[PDB]
Design an enzyme around this catalytic site. Sequence first.
Site, PDB file in Angstrom:
ATOM      1  N   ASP A 266      45.913 -87.424  13.253  1.00 20.12           N
ATOM      2  CA  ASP A 266      47.093 -86.841  12.930  1.00 20.12           C
ATOM      3  C   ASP A 266      47.706 -86.563  14.226  1.00 20.12           C
ATOM      4  O   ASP A 266      47.537 -85.737  14.882  1.00 20.12           O
ATOM      5  CB  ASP A 266      47.106 -85.320  11.993  1.00 20.12           C
ATOM      6  CG  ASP A 266      48.507 -84.614  11.826  1.00 20.12           C
ATOM      7  OD1 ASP A 266      49.566 -85.388  12.204  1.00 20.12           O
ATOM      8  OD2 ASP A 266      48.361 -83.616  11.392  1.00 20.12           O
TER       9      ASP A 266
ATOM     10  N   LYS B  48      57.216 -87.116  20.147  1.00 20.59           N
ATOM     11  CA  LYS B  48      57.471 -87.966  18.962  1.00 20.59           C
ATOM     12  C   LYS B  48      58.769 -87.725  18.654  1.00 20.59           C
ATOM     13  O   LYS B  48      59.247 -88.685  17.744  1.00 20.59           O
ATOM     14  CB  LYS B  48      56.640 -87.016  17.915  1.00 20.59           C
ATOM     15  CG  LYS B  48      56.334 -87.736  16.394  1.00 20.59           C
ATOM     16  CD  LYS B  48      55.173 -87.029  15.745  1.00 20.59           C
ATOM     17  CE  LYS B  48      55.374 -87.259  14.404  1.00 20.59           C
ATOM     18  NZ  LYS B  48      54.272 -86.949  13.477  1.00 20.59           N
TER      19      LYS B  48
ATOM     20  N   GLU C  88      52.333 -89.779   6.716  1.00 26.10           N
ATOM     21  CA  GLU C  88      51.522 -88.684   6.477  1.00 26.10           C
ATOM     22  C   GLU C  88      51.565 -87.911   5.191  1.00 26.10           C
ATOM     23  O   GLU C  88      50.406 -87.446   4.778  1.00 26.10           O
ATOM     24  CB  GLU C  88      52.366 -87.522   7.552  1.00 26.10           C
ATOM     25  CG  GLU C  88      52.355 -87.518   9.109  1.00 26.10           C
ATOM     26  CD  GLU C  88      53.455 -87.322   9.908  1.00 26.10           C
ATOM     27  OE1 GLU C  88      54.178 -86.116   9.396  1.00 26.10           O
ATOM     28  OE2 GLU C  88      53.409 -87.498  11.034  1.00 26.10           O
TER      29      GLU C  88
ATOM     30  N   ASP D 138      55.602 -80.003   3.221  1.00 26.54           N
ATOM     31  CA  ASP D 138      55.110 -80.063   4.680  1.00 26.54           C
ATOM     32  C   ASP D 138      56.067 -79.078   5.469  1.00 26.54           C
ATOM     33  O   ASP D 138      57.163 -79.442   6.003  1.00 26.54           O
ATOM     34  CB  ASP D 138      55.156 -81.356   5.288  1.00 26.54           C
ATOM     35  CG  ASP D 138      54.750 -81.432   6.539  1.00 26.54           C
ATOM     36  OD1 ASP D 138      54.188 -80.511   7.519  1.00 26.54           O
ATOM     37  OD2 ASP D 138      54.682 -82.530   7.175  1.00 26.54           O
TER      38      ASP D 138
END
Length: 390
Positions: free
Chosen positions: A12, A73, A177, A201
């Site tokens: 991850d 990211k 994800e 999330d």
Amino acid sequence: GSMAKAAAIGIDLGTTYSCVGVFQHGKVEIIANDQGNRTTPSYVAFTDTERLIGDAAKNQVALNPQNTVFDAKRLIGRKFGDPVVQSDMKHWPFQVINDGDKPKVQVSYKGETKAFYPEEISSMVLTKMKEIAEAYLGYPVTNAVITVPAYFNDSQRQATKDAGVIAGLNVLRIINEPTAAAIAYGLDRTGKGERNVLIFDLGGGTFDVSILTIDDGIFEVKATAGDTHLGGEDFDNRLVNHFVEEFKRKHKKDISQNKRAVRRLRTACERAKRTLSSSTQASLEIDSLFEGIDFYTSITRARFEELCSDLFRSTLEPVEKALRDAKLDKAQIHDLVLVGGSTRIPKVQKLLQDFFNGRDLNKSINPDEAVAYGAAVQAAILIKSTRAAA
Ligand SMILES: Nc1ncnc2c1nc(Br)n2[C@@H]1O[C@H](CO)[C@@H](O)[C@H]1O
Ligand SMILES: [Mg+2]
């Protein structure tokens, strides 16, 4: 005849924290790093003598803000002129430069000024996750599944693969994800018939909701929604402002201009925030916070819940938008899955459960580990090379 194959790993690669797992003996093992941590900060620091990655980079950030890189990211596969990039740069202490309309991070490293592409920084984080896995397995690791957000486009997906290749990994697949979180619960193994799954999330800096449909193990992303300005750091900011006011009332002193005192207060607030997820109250004990004054205080869970009340309620707006976009009603959702450490907050769980009329939430797999867990399950499936019997 045929030598035993090394295990493949599931990574991850998160915005703030990364996690690695391996599926062996019918189960997933989430692998702790050499400081005993099951998640590793996605941070890379540069000095005159070393390059530090993970906990070592994050622990020295206070005195080295210009040469410690985090949030790569948010830059991966994007153009320098993209409005998302331009806004984010104002919050970062490190330099982001323009190289042919591509962002690069520029730092002081080993006596020289060096610029890196976001994929190069991400490859340094992936090298650390590969070494964490090899320390547990006791042999070199080659194969990995890496996860990305469902909204990532082709350029963002290709740059993630490139980071994997630079790190010396063979990237088996880039998976979404929310799909990895669903796989972690075996939601693709329930047989024939359509199932609607909602993944909730809540990260350190962002909030994402995804609605997936699963039919005979086939996944379809039905809707995505979220809030780029809602995460665990906003709850930390609410406690910081509360305690700054508290110090002002009690000692008649404004601490907000001593960076060290603010930083020590914020560090303590984040830990108090974590304690409040298991306890109904938490102590705050800082020695010589400002002008040699010791700051020993407490905060109840009820007061913390009141301080962040508007923020917790705002998580239900993207849920309703995702359900409209998917053209579904809340009764039509079969499974609810929690992702991200901020989902351990009891009030966040209560609000969501109340919204879905008392339904149970899948939270048995640590929410900060669920994505890597599902990526490790997929990695072991992708390396199978069974030949059919007659
Ligand atoms: N038990 C927990 N209760 C409340 N919050 C938590 C917990 N564990 C984690 Br991890 N967090 C927060 O999750 C985010 C992950 O990027 C950070 O903001 C952490 O502070
Ligand atoms: Mg995540």
